[PDB]
Amino acid sequence: GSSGSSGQKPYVCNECGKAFGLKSQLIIHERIHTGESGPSSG
Ligand SMILES: [Zn+2]
């Protein structure tokens, strides 16, 4: 059931707090904060 409660994930997101066992995995995720098709507010 859990999305993934097993595995060492050093790469943690400082925006939400999502951990990614891989580096690039986090880089792509952080993108959601960097900018999503413009400023959410609008
Ligand atoms: Zn995040």
UniProtKB/Swiss-Prot annotation:
Tissue-specificity statement: Overexpressed in ovarian cancer tissues compared to normal ovarian tissues. Isoform 1 and isoform 2 are expressed in squamous epithelium tissues. Isoform 2 is overexpressed in squamous cervical cancer (at protein level). Expressed in blood cells. Isoform 1 is expressed in pancreas, lung, skeletal muscle, heart, placenta, liver, kidney and brain. Isoform 2 expressed in chronic lymphocytic leukemia (CLL) and several tumor cell lines. Isoform 3 is expressed in several tumor cells. Isoform 5 is expressed in fetal liver and several tumor cells.
Zinc finger (C2H2-type) stretch: 11-33
Highest taxon of the lineage: Eukaryota
Induction behaviour: Down-regulated during erythroid differentiation by GATA1. Down-regulated by HTLV-1 Tax through the CREB/ATF pathway. Up-regulated by the regulator of nonsense transcript UPF1. Up-regulated by the cyclic AMP-dependent transcription factor ATF4.
Protein localization: Cytoplasm
Quaternary state and interactors: Interacts (via the KRAB domain) with TRIM28 (via the RBCC domain); the interaction increases ZNF268 nuclear localization activity. Isoform 2 interacts with CHUK and IKBKB; the interaction is further increased in a TNF-alpha-dependent manner. Forms a ternary complex with TBK1 and SETD4; the interaction between SETD4 and TBK1 is ZNF268-dependent and leads to TBK1 monomethylation.
Family that this chain belongs to: Belongs to the krueppel C2H2-type zinc-finger protein family.
Comment field on protein domains: The KRAB domain functions to reinforce the nuclear localization of isoform 1 in addition to its transcription repression activity.
Function: Involved in the regulation of antiviral interferon signaling. During viral infection, recruits SETD4 to TBK1, leading to TBK1 monomethylation, which is critical for the assembly of TBK1 complex and IRF3 signaling.
Protein name: Zinc finger protein 268
Organism, as annotated: Homo sapiens
